[model samples]
Target: SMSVKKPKRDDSKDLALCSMILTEMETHEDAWPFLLPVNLKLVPGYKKVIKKPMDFSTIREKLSSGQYPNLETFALDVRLVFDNCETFNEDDSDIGRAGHNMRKYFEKKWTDTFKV
Candidate 1:
């Protein structure tokens, strides 16, 4: 017998929402540090700890190419950018502070956008 009710999670809205969030993040002042991947040449030790390097550019590419299967994965990648920053930089340092601010901003947006 066919089920009367179907439980499904559509990704169309998730993609749009993620895209909007990404655009806002790109324009954010604190976004500078997360716009591109950390230069391995300058920060040779970067890859040692941050095995999975994440950045807005890469995220955008993945989003455009449909690499992110769902909103949860997209959010994780976004969080990774900030998590890596905090792990590598001092809390009081410029980049670290920027990461902190950016993370806070994203979380607030994530909560507000999803809640509504």
Candidate 2:
């Protein structure tokens, strides 16, 4: 049987989005999807190019730092993160849809967290 590797982050609050993104990633020809024995060999060092994290984590840090004014900038930060994902268009694919969904999910969670 052909063996394929997949990545999963179950303990993630973003589980739904991660699952969808990984599901779609399995569709590519290079994915080499297989049965049970999956070998998840991640690239060793894409560090130099990937540089500073440019996605969710950064925004999360800023929020934790109270860089946003709960009522106003919170929404703006949500838009910024949503628009800056790896493939951000809502029409892009499951990835795009998941990205948008993740942001909306965080928005609600944050609003309730920082509510007036």
Candidate 3:
């Protein structure tokens, strides 16, 4: 008699959630002073706001503030994070790793959801 092997549980959902949350959180902040890849030094009024450094707290209060409704929303939010960050270039950096993994995780989720 041959015993069937069950598929491994996917914790990718949680990883995706964190990425989305960070993306959402990124939008909520007004500062991203990581020495941007593209300078906006004279873009009308760049001097108004101080260039603040990017910081991430592991247990942010609003990371899961009941804001994002579902996976699509989360995915969109994650996109927003990628869009908003200037130092988010995929250069094997820490932030890059987050974006890269989030993307990979999301891609897998899409495949798994459709069983493709």
Candidate 4:
């Protein structure tokens, strides 16, 4: 039998987005589909390059620091991750579609919540 593990929930980084989504769900019950796990890993080139596991944690801390100077750097890092994903799995159509949709959803939420 295949084992299935729940995705790790890093509160420090995910909390803000999770809270926003939860609140939105409470107010707009009909938006459940957008909240579902959209299999972003299936995106065509969604290969994640973890130079080190600590990289994610470090980025999370920097993002939560509320320091303006780090914002551009952090966004750049995110873009690189997306770009690498595309580069690594160029043949995965399903993953590409899922990844694209996931990015769209996140962008929309971030814009709506942070006005960025």
Candidate 5:
């Protein structure tokens, strides 16, 4: 008989963004159009009129309301932003890992919040 061992989980793991994603979203001119919309949507009360280009205060208010239909939506949006940022450079190797991490994060949150 063969013995099997479960993999150890590392709770101290830190997720750091690849420099490519950061540079593209923050400094690359060609990445702006795609990056702007995703970033804009994350702002709370994003629909509210804003004088400046980036105003997250309004969105923050909505998030704090506690009456929103789905809190996970915000998390999902965040995952999308990170996922998209990773893909902006046309590198697919990280996609699987990113997707797995995002899925697990959301799955745990969802199940814990709505336990059966």
Candidate 6:
């Protein structure tokens, strides 16, 4: 059996906020694209372009697993979801627009929650 390494810093506060924000994003109007991993079979080209894929489900798993070292690391994965969207979809496209809107919603919430 293997043991997991404990985080060097206490991230309870960060975890709480991440959980809250994730739940909100899961229910957001523009959250559809990021809720789960992109369907590779349906969008075959997705694999060709997006080397890294991130989704709300994966972020939840990472948070639960204690893989995120800090708030910034957790935010990076969250941002990846949008970044991949912009890469695969056009700025004016439906999913692309959704990504932009969701990114704004997340950043606004993130900044508002952490004043510093």
| Top TM-score hit | 1
Q: Count the backbone clashes (under 3 Å) in each candidate.
A: 0, 0, 0, 8, 5, 0
Model 3 off-target regions past 4 Å?
1-65, 85-87, 90-94, 114-116
Which one wins by TM-score: 1 or 2? 1
- Predictions in order: lDDT: 0.92, 0.43, 0.45, 0.43, 0.40, 0.90
For residue 96, model 5's alpha carbon misses the true position, in angstroms, by 7.0
Candidate 5 regions exceeding 4 Å error are 1-62, 65-69, 82-99
Q: Worst ten-residue run, lDDT, model 3?
A: 29-38
Residue-wise C-alpha lDDT for candidate 4, range 1-116, written one tens digit per residue: 26887785344544456345335432443333223322447633223443322222334554567532433455454444344434444435654454455445545765675453
Q: After superposition, how far is residue 52 of candidate 2 from its true place, in Å?
A: 14
Give Cα distance to truth, residue 100, candidate 4, Å: 1.6
The RMSD (Cα, Å) of candidate 2 is 17.8
Question: Could you say which candidate leads in lDDT?
Answer: 1
Better of 1 and 6 by lDDT: 1
After superposition, candidate 1 runs with Cα above 4 Å error: 1-10
TM-score, per-candidate, Cα-based: 0.90, 0.37, 0.33, 0.39, 0.29, 0.87
The model with the greater TM-score, 3 or 4, is 4
Candidate 5, backbone clash total: 5
lDDT of 3 at 10: 57
What value does the lDDT take at residue 107 in candidate 3?
Answer: 56
- Model 1 TM-score, all chains together: 0.90
lDDT of 1 by residue, 49-80 (tens): 89899999999999999999888899999999
Cα lDDT of model 6 by residue, 6-103, tens digit: 65655558889988999999999889888888988998788889999999999999989989988999899999999999988999999999999999
